[PDB]
Amino acid sequence: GITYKGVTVHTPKTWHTVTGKGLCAVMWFWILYRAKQDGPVVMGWRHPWDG
Amino acid sequence: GGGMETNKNKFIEDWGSARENLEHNFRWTRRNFALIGIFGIALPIIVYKGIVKDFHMQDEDAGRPHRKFL
Amino acid sequence: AAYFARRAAQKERVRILYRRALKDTLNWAVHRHIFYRDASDLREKFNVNQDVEDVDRIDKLIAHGEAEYNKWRHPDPYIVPWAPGGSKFCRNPTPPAGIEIVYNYGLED
Amino acid sequence: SVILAGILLKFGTYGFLRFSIPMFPEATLCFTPFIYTLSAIAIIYTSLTTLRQIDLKKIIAYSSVAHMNLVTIGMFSLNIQGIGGSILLMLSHGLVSSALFLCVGVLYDRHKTRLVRYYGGLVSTMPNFSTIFFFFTLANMSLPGTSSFIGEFLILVGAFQRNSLVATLAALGMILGAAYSLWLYNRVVSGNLKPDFLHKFSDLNGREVFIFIPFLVGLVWMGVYPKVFLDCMHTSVSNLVQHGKFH
Amino acid sequence: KKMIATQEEMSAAKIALGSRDMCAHLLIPLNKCRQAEFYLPWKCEDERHVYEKCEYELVMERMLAMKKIREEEALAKQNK
Amino acid sequence: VGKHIVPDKPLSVNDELMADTVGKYEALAWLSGGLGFFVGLGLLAVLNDKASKVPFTPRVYPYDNLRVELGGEP
Amino acid sequence: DHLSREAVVDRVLDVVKSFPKVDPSKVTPEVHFQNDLGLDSLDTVEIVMAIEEEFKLEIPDKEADKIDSCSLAIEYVYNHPMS
Amino acid sequence: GDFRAKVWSMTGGPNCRPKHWRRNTAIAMFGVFLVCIPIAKLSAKLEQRPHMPVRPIPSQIWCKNFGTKDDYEKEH
Amino acid sequence: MYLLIVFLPLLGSSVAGFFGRFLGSEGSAIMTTTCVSFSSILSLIAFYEVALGASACYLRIAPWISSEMFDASWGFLFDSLTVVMLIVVTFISSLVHLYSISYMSEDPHSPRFMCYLSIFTFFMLMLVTGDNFLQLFLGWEGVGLASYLLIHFWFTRLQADKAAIKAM
Amino acid sequence: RPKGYFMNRTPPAPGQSR
Amino acid sequence: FHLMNHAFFKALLFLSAGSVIHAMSDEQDMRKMGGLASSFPLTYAMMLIGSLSLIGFPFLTGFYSKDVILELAYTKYTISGNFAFWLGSVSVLFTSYYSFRLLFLTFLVPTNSFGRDISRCHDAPIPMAIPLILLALGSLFVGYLAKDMMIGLGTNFWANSLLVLPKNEILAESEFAAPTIIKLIPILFSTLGAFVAYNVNLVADQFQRAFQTSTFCNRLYSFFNKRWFFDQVLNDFLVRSFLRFGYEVSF
Amino acid sequence: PLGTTGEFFRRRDEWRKHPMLSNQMRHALPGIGIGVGAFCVYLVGEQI
Ligand SMILES: CCCCCCCCCCCC(=O)SCCNC(=O)CCNC(=O)[C@H](O)C(C)(C)COP(=O)(O)O
């Protein structure tokens, strides 16, 4: 932990930082991918049966 | 210090005994005339007529003359 | 004396009114930095009348002040969790002393 | 108190079933709205009175008046659900009310007070009594699974098919009955101890535990499997309802 | 668009009463794989797309039909 | 918890039973205004008449609008 | 754990040090706010509130106004089981 | 606390730490599994599946009540 | 197997409630969580046979209230709607029991808390699986009773008693 | 040993029975 | 479908919020928190997923159910249907506001918490951490993994469990006959709600003076904070009336 | 915090400038960099 005039804030454990970063990252990758495939469809530009 | 019996409180016990002797304080005030009039006579009558009318509506719904009661 | 006790009572009311008004201020401001300025303006309001010497004016200034705090008091003030009215109050409290448990009660003999 | 509320109270409703209802079938019909009004007034009025009672025994005793007037509603509905429900509530009340009088008697034997304000926090000193007190408190609220729910709902079914209005006013016993029953339980058992009033306690002994066991078995048994009772009653109940008519 | 799937065929495919429209015929092979493919979104994309094309055209036709009706209320109104 | 307060004064009759900044009838007046918002919007929905502004015809189902399948006499 | 008397005294000293009108050279654990350090009583209330915020305590209003000295507040905080 | 140490409860009271709680816990686990035995046989004898599943299921092994309610005009 | 889904939390609640003095905080936490977890695994399998496999289940135990035409019984109905609720109730409850194993670690009365968690789940299962209005009514009152017992779990707090009575 | 006694009865002398 | 979705993200929001309360020594007030975006990485990440899934952020668990509900309420051409569409749509702006206000005030603003509170923080142990992770996965994927199963056009997953008469089927028209502007109304309001929450909580410092000098603005704050005075009126006119009846009249 | 009361409390809140207790608004999006790059690497892979 790092002390600054009396108050001490302990460093979070490594797997707590890793898991938090990773799970959000999967979520961002999930959103960008689903925006790639369904963004055009929901924005109304095209249709699922178009082709 | 000793004994399971509760340590009585004079104000709690006076509170308790006041409740048991409420009929000694009953005075026919305007408030009591209204309360007994509204809730001792009027409301029972209204409920009775609503119950009887409920039967009578069932009578006409079934094509039958009104049922006499009392 | 009587005038000292009478004026000491007036001091105690004003000090408590300042203590409550300054806690109500942080309830409305929440953030520390907003609170700093709102704290100064409130102290700058007690400082305006800090020199009044008329004893009957003090009573009216107090009574007007108390009703002000009571009118613009935050409807949901902060309370420390274990303080009365807090979310942790009366939760798993220590058992009182002087409790006796009787065994072998209600025997036929 | 156990005999007074568990047995003696049943003589009037039993007299309605044994004599008044069958012998005078025309008179029974003409007076059904009158019976419905008195019963419905009593349930609502005496339940609200129970709320404001400050004596342990006064609350339990006042509760019986509300329960017996639901019994009269069912028996004057003059159908299988009404009469069968009225009898089942009679027997269930004779068990629940007696047990509740037994719970208060346990407390009064030790502490010699009936005032609710003196008690409080008994869960931390009498957990076995508190657990048994809670079960019979639930049975007094007609909780499904207990015996008193079987009689209560079967009566409401019987009353609904005759008069919807009396069934609705009677069903207000569910709201009011739960209010005072839970208020009684929490003011006595929950909260903190008050050592200035009471500082010496003893949970139930072996005799008191045995006394409650047949009551617990009785309410659960009729609560979940009331068929053993309804099987032995239905023929007599059916002939009571059919008495006086021939179609 | 004419009815192709008969009453027995829709009854045999246990089709919800709300889905016995004019594309009932394309729903039967779509539902047959949905049960077979555990209703997974990334399966039956071909059978799903033909069916969704149907249910879109039926709506457009009923939208075109109402447009004509809307265009006839104004004819009455201006000839008041 | 710490110490229950033993009464030193006579207890009131409504002692077994005993919302700070707003009064009683004033609170009802405010709440009726909020319920008046819901009533006002309901009337606007009446005057909007979105039923008179539907952009498609009602569905027509085959086989007599599913008369037999909906429980109608074969 | 409990918080030692020394820590209560020293953390209380720093709070009384941090006041603009109080000069941080005559702040001993027994000085008096309105007599040694020369403050108004409204200044004392601010000192009490900052003492509350340091230990996260909720003093009642009646007891809070009784605190007129550094020594007083030190005893009050130390004797508190939740400090 | 202090008096609660002289109070018997079924749930154990505050801060219950029985010395042999592991052997007690396993004895409880064996008991509940034993009680789960008659429940399973009664359930399998009482389950009724009117429709054959589209695929084989775990219950097509212990349960023999599949596709038996087809003649519902005979139900009584 | 379907009966095990409903009655497993009851057995776990019964063991920690009646024999928590022999199991303590650790044993009761283990017992109620495992019984709820196994009930959650069987719910996934029941979802397999009833929703994806499209094969519904009906189970009648015994009559409950038979009086002329009134036909309330102890009967269970498992269709797609039921197994969807079954998945929601048992899976989230298994996680909350696990979560409570650590969250209520320092509470004096954990074995009773775990007992109340499992009895609520059993009543919630009785609610969603009832094949009749009365069996539904029983679980409707049971979840209210269990909610009442857990809202004022800290029975010394006056605010908790007021809320629990209000909720009822 | 557990806390308290079942039904608040003190156990008999060791080797004896209630 | 929306019930199943709500279970995964409301449990995440509550179970994650409980981890904050445990770490801050049972502190529940947001006006005494602030900071902890770095002090609690796993908890903030879990609350971020759930709160974003709640407001209906696209392609998360909350987007596949809530947005269809507002689209179906638009496709219902009745007096009640038009009533719900307005109130539902205006509500999505209010939920986004209180969702990000929770996110901003608890972890992102400069700390308003106590010194002894931040000195005793700790993140969730395994029996608390594992359910949070699992609920996060369910809050990202179940909504997508189950859309075709429960609400897919013509899906027979429900068999005979749910009945809808043909005269009431409006799902097809909702996804084909609706303007593309409707299918965006939630994100316009959601984005606006995030922006208004960021403005009031981080760039506003005198939006609180009106509540302290104006009687109407003071009363309007109390109205919404005290739940439209619903409890008070009920207690003052209904609960007290029945309680007073029991003693003064029937007894 | 110009006034006496104000600057006093500003002095008391000096600990709030902690390196990992401030600038907490740049931690608003964990894994945003990882997720964006993981999408790009997938995007180049899709091309082939
Ligand atoms: C939202 C909340 C609203 C805010 C509420 C606003 C409250 C109204 C503020 C204005 C009302 C007043 O000034 S109240 C009247 C205040 N004036 C006096 O009391 C006379 C001065 N006498 C003294 O002794 C001291 O200066 C004294 C200051 C008392 C300290 O006492 P000490 O000798 O121990 O330091």
Q: Reduce the secondary structure of chain K to three states and give it as a string.
A: CHHHHHHHHHHHHHHHHHHHHHHCCCCCCHHHCCCCCCCCHHHHHHHHHHHHHHHCCCCCCCHHHHHHHHHHHHHCCCHHHHHHHHHHHHHHHHHHHHHHHHHHHHHHCCCCCCHHHHCCCCCCCHHHHHHHHHHHHHHHHHHHHHHHHHHCCCCCCCCCCCCCCHHHCCHHHHHHCCCCCHHHHHHHHHHHHHHHHHHHHHCCCCCCCHHHHCHHHHHHHHHHHCHHHHHHHHHHHHHHHHHHHHHHCCC
F45 to F41, F56, K85, K87, K185: CA distances (angstroms): 6, 20, 10, 11, 19
- In sign, the C-alpha dihedral spanning H70, H76, I1, I4 is positive
Number of separate domains in chain E: 1
Ligand 1 centroid – CA C91 distance (Å): 38
Write out the H or E segment, with its range, that includes residue I58: strand I57-67
Q: Which amino acid is at K202?
A: L
Q: Which two tokens stand for residue C93?
A: 């409290």
I75 vs I66: CA distance, rounded Å: 13
Q: Kindly list the residues from chain E whose CB atom is less than 8 angstroms away from the CB atom of residue I54.
A: 35
Residue among E31, I45, C32 at smallest CA distance from H56:
I45
Structural tokens at position B31? 């408030």
Cβ(K148)–Cβ(I52) under 8 Å? no
For residue A7, the SS3 value is: strand
**Paired sense of beta strands I57-67 and I70-78, if any:** antiparallel
Q: How far apart are CA D178 and CA B46, in angstroms?
A: 27
**Separation of alpha carbons I109 and H4, rounded Å:** 12
Nearest in space to E66 (alpha carbons), one of F60, I127, H11: F60
How far are the Cα atoms of D16, I115, L1, L7 from residue L4, in angstroms, in the given order? 86, 57, 8, 5
Q: Looking at residue I66, what DSSP letter applies?
A: E
Could you tell me which residues come within 8 angstroms of residue F37 by beta carbon, excluding any fewer than 6 positions away? none
Q: D55 forms bridges with which residues in the sheet?
A: D115
List chain J gaps (C–N > 2.5 A) by preceding residue: none
Kindly report the nearest CA distance between residue C63 and chain F, in angstroms: 18
The DSSP code for B26 is -
Residue A9 phi, psi dihedral angles, 5° rounding: -120, 115
Give C90→chain F minimum CA distance, Å: 7
Q: Which residues of J touch D128 (CB under 8 A)?
A: 7
Chain L interface, best mutation among K49, K111, K116, by max L CB count within 10 A? K111
Q: Is some CB atom of chain C closer than 8 A to the CB atom of K205?
A: yes
Question: How many Cβ atoms from other residues are within 10 Å of residue F53's Cβ?
Answer: 10
**Beta carbons within 8 Å of H8's beta carbon, 6+ residues apart:** D127, D128, D203, I21, J2, J3, J4, J5, J6, J7, J8
Of I131, I139, I7, which is closest to residue I59 (Cα–Cα)?
I131
Q: B24: helix, coil or strand?
A: helix
Cβ within 8 Å of residue F27, ≥6 positions away: F19, K229, K232, K233, K236
The tokens describing B36, both together, are: 């007994």
HEC assignment per residue over I91-144: HHHHHHHHHHHHHCCCCCCHHHHHHHHHHHHHHHHHHHHECCHHHHHHHHHHHH
Ligand 1 centroid from CA C15, angstroms = 7
C-beta of residue F26 within 8 angstroms of C-beta of residue K232:
no
The neighbouring-strand residues paired with D27 are: none
* Chain E neighbours, 3+ Cβ pairs < 8 A: A, F, I, K
Q: How far apart are CA D125 and CA I60, in angstroms?
A: 43
Strands D200-201 and A7-9, how do they pair? unpaired
As a whole number of angstroms, the distance between CA K130 and CA K113 comes to: 27
What CA–CA distance (Å, rounded) separates G7 from F59?
80
Residue from the list F21, F24, F42 with its beta carbon closest to the beta carbon of K236: F24
Q: What is the dihedral of CA J9, J10, J13, J16, to 10 degrees?
A: 20
Place of tokens 């889905």: E19
Q: How many CA atoms lie within 13 A of G64 on its CB side?
A: 24
* Cα L13 to averaged position of ligand 1 atoms, centre (Å): 26
**Min distance C105 CA to chain H CA atoms (Å):** 14
Alpha-carbon Rg of chain G, whole angstroms? 12
Residue of E nearest to A48 (CA): E49
In chain A the first and final C-alpha atoms are separated, in Å, by 59
**Is F9 in contact with B11 (Cβ distance < 8 A)?**
yes
| Residue pair K245/D45 in contact by the 8 Å Cβ criterion | no
Residues in C closer than 8 angstroms to L21, CB to CB, are none
Burial letters for I42-74: b for 16+ Cβ neighbours within 10 Å, e otherwise? Answer: bbebbbbbbbbbbbbbbbeeeebbbbbebebbb
Residue of C35, C50, C60, C70 to test ligand 1 pocket, by largest number of atoms within 8 Å of CB: C50
Residue F50 has, within 13 A of its CA and on its CB side, a CA count of 18
**CA–CA distances in Å: residue D174 to residues B53, D142, D156, I50, I139:** 25, 8, 11, 37, 16
- Give D20's DSSP letter: I
Give Cα K111 to chain centroid, integer Å: 24
| Residue positions counted in chain K | 251
List the helix and strand counts (H, then E) for chain C. 3, 1
Q: Provide the b/e sequence for D23-60 (b: ≥16 CB within 10 Å).
A: eeeeebbeebbebbbbbbbbbbbbbbbbbbbbbbbbbb
Query: How many residues are present in chain A?
Result: 51
- Cα separation, D70 vs D38, in Å, equals 10
- Residue G40: active-site member: yes
CA distances (Å), origin C24, targets C36, C70, C79? 13, 10, 11
Whether I110 and I138 have beta carbons less than 8 Å apart is answered as: no
Do residues K158 and K72 lie in contact, with contact meaning Cβ atoms separated by under 8 Å?
Answer: no
CA distance D152 to chain F (A): 29
CA nearest B43: which of E72, K221, C32, D169? D169
**How far does CA D135 lie from the centroid of its chain?**
13
Residue closest to I139 by CA, chosen among I152, I123, I163, I116: I123
Strands (E), chain C: 100-101
- Resolved by: cryo-EM
CB I31 within 8 A of CB I23: yes
Query: Hunting for tokens 């069903």 — which residue is that?
Result: D171
CA triple C76-C82-C87, angle to 5 deg: 45
Q: Does A29 touch chain K (CB under 8 A)?
A: no
DSSP-derived 3-state class of residue I63 = strand
Q: How far apart are CA D232 and CA C3, in angstroms?
A: 89
Distance K209 CA to ligand 1 centre (A): 22
* Beta strands at H47-48 and D200-201: parallel, antiparallel or unpaired: unpaired
Between chains, do L12 and G53 touch, taking CB under 8 Å as contact?
Answer: yes
Nearest chain C Cα distance for residue H13, angstroms: 13
Helix then strand then coil, % of chain D, to nearest 5: 80, 0, 20
Residue with tokens 């809670």: D134
Contact, G70 vs G13, CB < 8 A? yes
Atom of ligand 1 nearest to the CA of K212: 1
Q: Tokens 């007021």 label which residue?
A: I162
CA of C66 to the centre of ligand 1 (A): 11
Q: Give I139-145's long-range contacts (Cβ < 8 A, gap of 24+).
A: I141/D143, I141/D144, I142/D144, I142/D145, I144/I168, I145/D138, I145/D143
Question: Which DSSP state fits I50?
Answer: I
Greatest alpha-carbon pair distance for chain A in Å reads 67
Shortest Cα–Cα distance, E75 to chain I (Å): 50
K positions 66-95 inside 8 Å of F (CB): 77-83, 86-87
- The angle formed by the CA atoms of residues K221, K225 and K226, to the nearest 5 degrees, is 115
Distance between CA atoms of residues I18 and I112, nearest Å: 10
Distance CA D106, CA D125 (A): 14
- Does the beta carbon of D131 lie under 8 angstroms from any beta carbon of chain J? no
Q: How many CA atoms, within 13 angstroms, populate the side-chain half-sphere of residue J12? A: 4
Residues with CB under 6 A from ligand 1: C 10-11, 14, 17, 21, 24, 45-46, 49-50, 52, 58, 61-62, 65, 68-69, 72; G 40-42; K 212
- Taking the centre of ligand 1 as the mean of its atom positions, its distance from the CA of residue C34, in whole angstroms, is 23
Report which secondary-structure segment, H or E, holds H15.
none
Which stretch of DSSP H or E encloses residue D200? Answer: strand D200-201
Specify whether the CB–CB gap between K156 and E34 falls below 8 A.
yes
Residue to substitute in C4, C35, C41, C46 for testing ligand 1 pocket (most ligand atoms within 8 angstroms of CB): C46
- Which three-class secondary structure state does DSSP give residue C101? strand
Query: Nearest residue on chain E to A51, judged by CA atoms?
Result: E49
Q: Which residue has the tokens 């307005």?
A: K86
- Tokens representing C23 are 């806690």
Q: Does J4 touch chain C (CB under 8 A)?
A: yes
State the Cα–Cα distance between residues H11 and H28, nearest whole angstrom.
Answer: 14
Contact predicate K110/K35, CB 8 Å = yes
Amino acid at residue number E49: H
List of chain K residues whose C-beta atoms are within 8 Å of the C-beta of residue I98: 127, 130-131
**What is the rounded CA–CA span in Å between residue E67 and residue E79?**
19
Cβ within 8 Å, pair F21-C93: no
Residue K209: CB atoms within 10 A of its CB come to 14
I78 sits in which H/E element? strand I70-78
Q: What is the token pair recorded at D66?
A: 């509300």
- As beta bridge partners, residue A4 has A7
Whole-number Å distance, alpha carbon C49 to ligand 1 midpoint, is 7
Q: Which of B51, B53, K246 is nearest to D66 (CA)?
A: K246
Query: What are the distances in angstroms from CA K75 to CA D214, E18, F54, K171?
Result: 61, 16, 9, 8
In G, minimum Cα distance to C45 occurs at G42
Which residue, among K135, K143, K137, has the nearest Cα to I96 in the 3D structure?
A: K135
Boundaries of domain holding C18: 1-109
Element (H, E) at G41: helix G41-55
SS3 C77: coil
| CA neighbours closer than 13 Å in the CB half-sphere of residue B67 | 22
Q: Which of G40, G61, G65, G68 is catalytic?
A: G40
If you compute the radius of gyration of chain F from its CA atoms, what whole number of angstroms results? 30
Query: K37 and L15: CB-CB below 8 Å?
Result: no
Strand partners, H48: I58
Cβ of H17 within 8 Å of Cβ of I49? The answer is no
Those of residues 86-105 in C touching chain I at CB distance below 8 A are 89-93
Q: How far is CA F71 from CA B34, F65, F67, L3, in A?
A: 59, 12, 7, 82
Quote the CA–CA distance of K69 and B62 in Å, as a whole number: 45
Domain count, chain C: 1
Total count of residues recorded for chain C: 109
Q: Could you give the strand order of the β-sheet that contains I57-67, starting from the edge strand earlier in sequence?
A: H47-48, I57-67, I70-78
Q: Does D154 touch chain J (CB under 8 A)?
A: no
- Cβ–Cβ below 8 Å for E21 and F59: yes
Return the structure tokens found at H57.
């299921």
Interface of F with E in 15-54 (CB under 8 A): 54
The neighbour count for residue B45, using CB atoms within 10 Å, is 10
Q: Please, what's the b/e burial string for E48-67 (b: 16 or more CB within 10 A of its CB; e: otherwise)?
A: bbebbebbbebbeebeeebe
Helix (H) or strand (E) holding B40: none
Q: What is the CA radius of gyration of chain C?
A: 23
Cα I69 versus chain centre, distance = 30
Whether I109 and I24 have beta carbons less than 8 Å apart is answered as no
Scanning chain A, the segments in alpha helix (DSSP H) are 14-42
Q: Please name the amino acid found at residue K174.
A: S
- Count Cα neighbours of I153 within 13 Å in the Cβ-side half-sphere: 16
For residues K128 and C106, give the distance between their C-alpha atoms in angstroms, rounded to a whole number: 48
Tell me the CA–centroid distance for residue G43 and ligand 1, in Å: 12
> How many angstroms separate the most distant Cα atoms in chain F?
85
Domain that holds residue E63: 1-80
C-alpha to C-alpha distance for I51 and E39, rounded to whole angstroms: 10
Residues recorded for chain D = 247
L44 at the A interface (CB within 8 A)? Answer: no
> Helix H segments across F1-74?
24-48, 62-66
Rounded Cα–Cα distance for residues K215 and I124 (Å): 47
C-alpha closest to that of K134 among I125, I126, I40 = I40
Rounded-to-integer distance, Cα D1 and Cα D7, Å: 10
Q: Which chains touch B (3 or more CB pairs under 8 A)?
A: D, F, K
For residue G32 the two structure tokens come to 């008096």
Are L15 and A23 an interchain contact pair (Cβ–Cβ within 8 Å)?
no
Residue B32 forms contact with D (CB below 8 Å): no
Give, for A12, the enclosing helix (H) or strand (E).
Answer: none
Handedness of CA C17, C18, C21, C22 (dihedral sign): negative
Q: CA F52 to CA G1: how far, in whole Å? A: 73
CA-wise closest residue to D155 among D226, D242, D89: D89
Residues in E closer than 8 angstroms to F69, CB to CB, are 7, 11, 17, 20
The partner residues of I74 in beta bridges, in order of sequence, read: I62
Contact J9 C101 (CB under 8 A): no
Q: Locate breaks in chain F with C to N over 2.5 A; list the residue preceding each.
A: 18
Cα–Cα distance, D60 to D181 (Å, whole number): 9
How close are the terminal C-alpha atoms of chain E, in Å? 37
**Beta carbons within 8 Å of E27's beta carbon, 6+ residues apart:** E13, E15, E19, E51, K154
**Tokens matching residue G17:** 């040090």
SS3 state of residue C82: coil
CB contact under 8 A, J8 and D205: yes
Residues C29 and C74: beta-carbon distance below 8 Å: no
Query: CA torsion angle for G81, H2, H7, H12 (degrees, to 10)?
Result: 60
